[PDB]
Motif scaffolding. Structure first.
Motif, mmCIF file in Angstrom:
data_model
loop_
_atom_site.group_PDB
_atom_site.id
_atom_site.type_symbol
_atom_site.label_atom_id
_atom_site.label_comp_id
_atom_site.label_asym_id
_atom_site.label_seq_id
_atom_site.Cartn_x
_atom_site.Cartn_y
_atom_site.Cartn_z
ATOM 1 N N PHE A 140 0.788 -1.229 0.000
ATOM 2 C CA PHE A 140 0.000 0.000 0.000
ATOM 3 C C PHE A 140 0.821 1.281 0.000
ATOM 4 O O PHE A 140 1.897 1.339 0.598
ATOM 5 C CB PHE A 140 -1.059 0.006 1.107
ATOM 6 N N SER A 141 0.295 2.296 -0.680
ATOM 7 C CA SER A 141 0.899 3.624 -0.731
ATOM 8 C C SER A 141 0.416 4.472 0.448
ATOM 9 O O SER A 141 -0.767 4.450 0.814
ATOM 10 C CB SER A 141 0.547 4.323 -2.028
ATOM 11 N N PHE B 272 4.354 0.581 1.488
ATOM 12 C CA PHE B 272 4.549 -0.453 2.498
ATOM 13 C C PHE B 272 4.251 -1.817 1.933
ATOM 14 O O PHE B 272 3.455 -1.946 0.991
ATOM 15 C CB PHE B 272 3.632 -0.211 3.694
ATOM 16 N N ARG B 273 4.903 -2.825 2.505
ATOM 17 C CA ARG B 273 4.589 -4.221 2.257
ATOM 18 C C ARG B 273 4.130 -4.903 3.548
ATOM 19 O O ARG B 273 4.846 -4.934 4.555
ATOM 20 C CB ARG B 273 5.798 -4.946 1.677
ATOM 21 N N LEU B 274 2.923 -5.439 3.515
ATOM 22 C CA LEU B 274 2.407 -6.173 4.646
ATOM 23 C C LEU B 274 2.449 -7.660 4.309
ATOM 24 O O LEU B 274 1.614 -8.165 3.564
ATOM 25 C CB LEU B 274 1.007 -5.691 5.031
ATOM 26 N N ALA B 275 3.464 -8.335 4.848
ATOM 27 C CA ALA B 275 3.688 -9.760 4.599
ATOM 28 C C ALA B 275 2.511 -10.592 5.105
ATOM 29 O O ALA B 275 1.854 -10.208 6.081
ATOM 30 C CB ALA B 275 4.971 -10.201 5.267
ATOM 31 N N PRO B 276 2.240 -11.744 4.461
ATOM 32 C CA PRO B 276 1.106 -12.555 4.911
ATOM 33 C C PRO B 276 1.212 -12.978 6.389
ATOM 34 O O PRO B 276 0.180 -13.132 7.049
ATOM 35 C CB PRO B 276 1.139 -13.772 3.973
ATOM 36 N N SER C 297 6.816 -3.709 6.404
ATOM 37 C CA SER C 297 8.045 -3.012 6.023
ATOM 38 C C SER C 297 7.734 -1.888 5.043
ATOM 39 O O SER C 297 6.631 -1.847 4.469
ATOM 40 C CB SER C 297 9.045 -3.994 5.400
ATOM 41 N N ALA C 298 8.693 -0.978 4.868
ATOM 42 C CA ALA C 298 8.569 0.137 3.913
ATOM 43 C C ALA C 298 9.735 0.128 2.921
ATOM 44 O O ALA C 298 10.697 0.886 3.062
ATOM 45 C CB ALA C 298 8.480 1.463 4.626
#
Ligand SMILES: [Mg+2]
Length: 290
Positions: free
Chosen positions: A129-130, A155-159, A164-165
């Motif tokens: 997500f931005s 951002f990355r939201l791992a399963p 993380s960004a």
């Protein structure tokens, strides 16, 4: 209506295909996603603090009020509805129609998020997500608030729950779409350009450069079809580009289009959030899936 820059553009639509308004009376439509289990596209009106549903049988129904200024939407791997929330400054999940909303990302390293704008699902199941600052900068688009983070990131939201960004070099990152290669496109509404990143596996990225720009206006939301073509918002509609970023043509809308999604009963309808209205056109293609 259709304006071809190259002949093969017309192959993308049934004969006599035309962009048509589905609904009006909105302030600023945004964040559409088709939910097959509900046979409906869900989209936001960011400036009216509500979301709407457009069913495959052609009905407009209220979805959420207040929505806490939800903006972008996608589905996760399980087909749960995922929303970016301006008002709650978080990414949130809804399992079932009418169900409670669950926060899935609401802070980074002891700091509030800015105001998630758009979101998409990665082939590995991660939610990207931005996080630009529109949701807290514009009182019409949220509940206010001040920035706590150093910048406006993707951002990355791992399963597994790890946040993380990996993308920190953008000005106002906005639309996001994965490519068949598994690499990522990022529209920047401060830079006024769409950018390309390679994903060196597992939440680490390298900036490749500017993939394309559009005129008039700028790319907010964007999508990629099953063949890798890029369907990009702009001031005059949706620009359809080759995987390398060359214009095939445009689907013209009378006002600016902010976002779009593939859906409908065959997966081949392109929905468009066109400012005060909601529009669609029939195509011969589906959205990319993985
Ligand atoms: Mg956006």
């Amino acid at each position: 209506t259709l304006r071809a820059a190259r002949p093969e553009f017309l192959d993308l639509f049934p004969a006599g295909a035309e962009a048509r308004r589905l609904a009006d009376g909105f302030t600023w439509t945004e964040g559409p996603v088709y939910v097959p289990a509900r046979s409906a596209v869900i989209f936001s009106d960011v400036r009216q603090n509500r979301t709407w549903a457009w069913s495959d049988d052609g009905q407009l129904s209220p979805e959420m009020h207040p929505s806490h200024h939800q903006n972008g939407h996608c589905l996760n791997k399980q087909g749960h509805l995922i929303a970016c929330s301006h008002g709650l400054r978080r990414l949130e999940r809804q399992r079932e129609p009418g169900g409670e909303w669950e926060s899935i990302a609401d802070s980074f390293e002891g700091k509030k998020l800015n105001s998630p704008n758009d979101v998409c699902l990665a082939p590995d199941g991660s939610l990207w997500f931005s996080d630009p600052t529109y949701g807290i900068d514009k009182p019409e688009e949220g509940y206010g608030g001040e920035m706590e983070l150093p910048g406006r990131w993707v951002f990355r939201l791992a399963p597994d729950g790890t946040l993380s960004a990996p993308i920190r070099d953008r000005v106002k990152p906005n639309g996001l779409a994965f490519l068949p290669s598994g690499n990522l496109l990022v529209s920047d509404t401060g830079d006024n350009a769409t950018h390309r990143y390679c994903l060196n596996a597992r939440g680490e990225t390298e900036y490749q450069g500017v993939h394309f720009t559009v005129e008039p206006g700028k790319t907010d939301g964007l999508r990629v079809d099953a063949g890798g073509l890029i369907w990009a918002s702009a001031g005059d509609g949706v620009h359809v580009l080759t995987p390398d970023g060359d214009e095939l043509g445009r689907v013209l809308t009378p006002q600016t289009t902010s976002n779009l999604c593939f859906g409908g009963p065959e997966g081949r309808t392109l929905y468009m959030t066109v400012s005060t209205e909601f529009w669609s056109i029939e195509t011969n293609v589906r959205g990319l899936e993985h």
